[PDB]
């Protein structure tokens, strides 16, 4: 590991615990190292942390309102571009944020991520991180 990294902000806390339990329940990914990193506003990342961002095999981005606010911090954005790459390794879950063309200004390969919604079947969630680590 790290194999699967769930990046989220505190407003999407429960979505994060939901996916953890689902991923640990499922045969395709239960066996993998599944870590989480909560973004803001209490902190930036520790040495051992920003490591994980760059080192993980697959990233799952919980797209909440509080999370995209971090896309607007220029000290931080360049790290996120290098972390959320390459696009076939990135999954986003829309958490009360409508998808948009503006995101292409922050992440140029945005359109090539795997996208999930709040009303997707659980099998869809797991198939996406299965496809992303494989």
Q: What are phi and psi of 23, to 5 degrees?
A: -70, -30
> Residue 29: CB partners within 8 Å, gap ≥ 6?
3, 4, 23, 126, 129, 130, 133
- Report the structure determination method: X-ray
Beta strands in 22-80 (DSSP E): 34-38, 58-63
Which domain CATH number covers 45?
3.40.50.10140
Burial category of 105 from C-beta neighbours within 10 Å (exposed 0-12, middle 13-18, buried 19 and up): exposed
Resolution, angstroms, 1 dp: 2.5
**Judging by DSSP bridges, how do beta strands 90-94 and 114-116 pair with one another?**
parallel
Query: Structurally, how many domains does the chain consist of?
Result: 1
Cα Dmax for the chain: 39
* Domain containing residue 132: 1-134
Cis-peptide, bond into residue 27, ω within 30° of zero: no
Given a contact cutoff of 8 angstroms between Cβ atoms, the answer to whether 58 and 81 are in contact is: no
Which candidate, 72, 5, 83, 18, places its Cα nearest to that of 40?
72
């Amino acid at each position: 590991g790290c194999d699967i990294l769930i990046v989220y902000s505190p407003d999407a806390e429960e979505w994060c615990q939901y996916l953890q339990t689902l991923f640990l329940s499922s045969r395709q990914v239960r066996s993998q190292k599944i870590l989480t990193h909560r973004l803001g506003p209490e902190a930036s990342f520790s040495a051992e942390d920003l490591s994980l961002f760059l080192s993980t095999r697959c990233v799952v981005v919980l797209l909440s309102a509080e999370l995209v606010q971090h896309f607007h911090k220029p000290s931080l954005l360049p790290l996120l571009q290098r972390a959320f790459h390459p696009p076939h390794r990135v999954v986003r879950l829309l958490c009360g944020v409508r998808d948009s063309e503006e995101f292409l200004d922050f992440f140029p390969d945005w359109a090539h991520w795997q996208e999930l919604t709040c009303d997707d079947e659980p099998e869809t969630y797991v198939a996406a991180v299965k496809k992303a680590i494989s």
